[PDB]
Structure 1
């Protein structure tokens, strides 16, 4: 239930110890947590703040087609992965704009700089969208989720389609204790723009219901987890659709669960709001495979959230 998510935020506010982090933002953090969502009780898109489903859909579909270039996202007005690509670009020999070192913090502190970053970021998005040589070089994030799900590269010149294999094993071997997809590929991790935050997931089938457990090594509680929960709930629904199953539970297991220190007022504001009913997922009945779904084939209905709560992403 949404309550389980809100209790996590509250526990971190109360007892999450301060921890320096890679991003230089600083976090309050706990280690080891588990939340369960019964998918039969509604689609888990949070109601205590508006969570944009279109972004969640486009990101999942991008994962599912095995794509690790941000061009596909930009064409669907999804900018959630922009900063890491832009970061690679501004560190490259080809960038010749104003200095962008530490842009992630500097935009919050210095408005003249915020305006330069907005200008450079606009030119970057334009070039990815319109210049295919530029897209190919600078849209690339390395072998992140899409690549490992669809195209885990083997030692003898091939690739494993892990996710398609797990879907097929659910159909013919539902009681398998190995229905696993891992994005943690030790060889590719160093050249990934980020190692996988949502790291490994496992399926389970009982009395015609499909459940999914995600192990998430690193969880951005305010900004990222709402996306992650909906993303894996959507995936479980797509797979249940293809395999002719009903949906069971999504179980979300966390390693370093953290609230960024500049998300604290936002989380507090969120905790002051009454929970509403989760919406309902609607999927196009005519699509057979998970890999056949496009944007128009997936919607959420009866979604009536409290207003958007804005917060800065830690780069």
Structure 2
């Protein structure tokens, strides 16, 4: 239930001790958490603030087609993966605009700098979208979620399609205890723009219902977790659709659940709002495979949330 999520954010506000982090922003943090969402009770897209499903869709599709290049994402006007690509670009030999050291923090404090970042960011996206050589070198994120789900590279010159295998074990072996997809590949971690935040997931089956547990090593509570819940819920409806099954519980397990110190006013303002009905997910009955779904094949209807609460993304 939404309440479960809202309770996480309260609990970190109350009890989460302060902890320095890679990004430099600062966080309040807990270790070890578990939220459950019965998906039969509604599609878990938060109603206490507007959460952009279109962006959740395209990021999922992007993960399922096995792709790790932002061009696809930018073609559908999704900029949620932009900064890590931009950061890679500005640290490269090829970049020659103004010094973008520390842009993640300096856009908040310095207005003529944010304008400069805004300019460079705009030429970066237009280069990715219109220069195939540039897209190819600088849209790339490494072997992040998509590469590991579809094309986990083997020792002897091949690849394992993890996701597709697990879908097929669900169909023929619904009681197996190894319905597991991992994105944590120790070989590829240092190559990755970021190691996987949602690290690994497991499926389970009882009386014709499909349930999923996610292990998430690092959980950005205000910005990310609303994405991840919806992302993994959508994935579960997709797999239940392909596999001919009803939809079960999504269980969200966390390692470091953190509230960025600059998300606190947002998380308090979110707590002051009454919970509304979850929406209903709608899928194309004509599509048969998880991997056949496109943007028009997935809608959410009945979504009537409270207003957008803006916050700054860490790094």
TM over 0.5: yes
Distance in 1 (CA, whole Å) between partners of 2:70 and 2:205 is: 34
Q: CA deviation at 1:176?
A: 0.1
Distance in 1 (CA, whole Å) between partners of 2:130 and 2:293 is: 26
Distance in 1 (CA, whole Å) between partners of 2:272 and 2:147 is: 40
Q: CA deviation at 1:32?
A: 0.1
Q: Deviations over 1:107-156 (max 9, x none)?
A: 00000000000000000000000000000000000000000000000000
Q: Deviations over 1:69-106 (max 9, x none)?
A: 00000000000000000000000000000000000000
Q: CA deviation at 1:313?
A: 0.1
Q: Deviations over 1:168-196 (max 9, x none)?
A: 00000000000000000000000100000
What number of residue pairs does the alignment pair up?
315
Q: CA deviation at 1:254?
A: 0.2
Distance in 1 (CA, whole Å) between partners of 2:311 and 2:264 is: 9
Q: CA deviation at 1:35?
A: 0.1
What TM-score, normalized by structure 1, do the two folds share?
Answer: 1.00
Q: CA deviation at 1:278?
A: 0.1
Q: CA deviation at 1:39?
A: 0.1
Q: CA deviation at 1:34?
A: 0.1
Q: CA deviation at 1:19?
A: 0.1
Q: CA deviation at 1:51?
A: 0.2
Q: CA deviation at 1:302?
A: 0.2
Match of 2:206 in 1: 206
Q: CA deviation at 1:258?
A: 0.1
Q: Deviations over 1:16-64 (max 9, x none)?
A: 0000000000000000000000000000000000000000000000000
Q: CA deviation at 1:297?
A: 0.1
SS across alignment from 2:60: helix
RMSD, aligned α-carbons:
0.2
Question: What 5-or-longer segments of structure 2 have no aligned partner?
Answer: none
Q: Deviations over 1:197-216 (max 9, x none)?
A: 00000000000000000000
Distance in 1 (CA, whole Å) between partners of 2:136 and 2:205 is: 40
Q: CA deviation at 1:304?
A: 0.1
SS across alignment from 1:185: coil
SS across alignment from 1:286: coil
Q: CA deviation at 1:312?
A: 0.2
SS across alignment from 1:32: strand
Distance in 1 (CA, whole Å) between partners of 2:244 and 2:113 is: 53
Distance in 1 (CA, whole Å) between partners of 2:127 and 2:38 is: 43
Distance in 2 (CA, whole Å) between partners of 1:278 and 1:21 is: 34
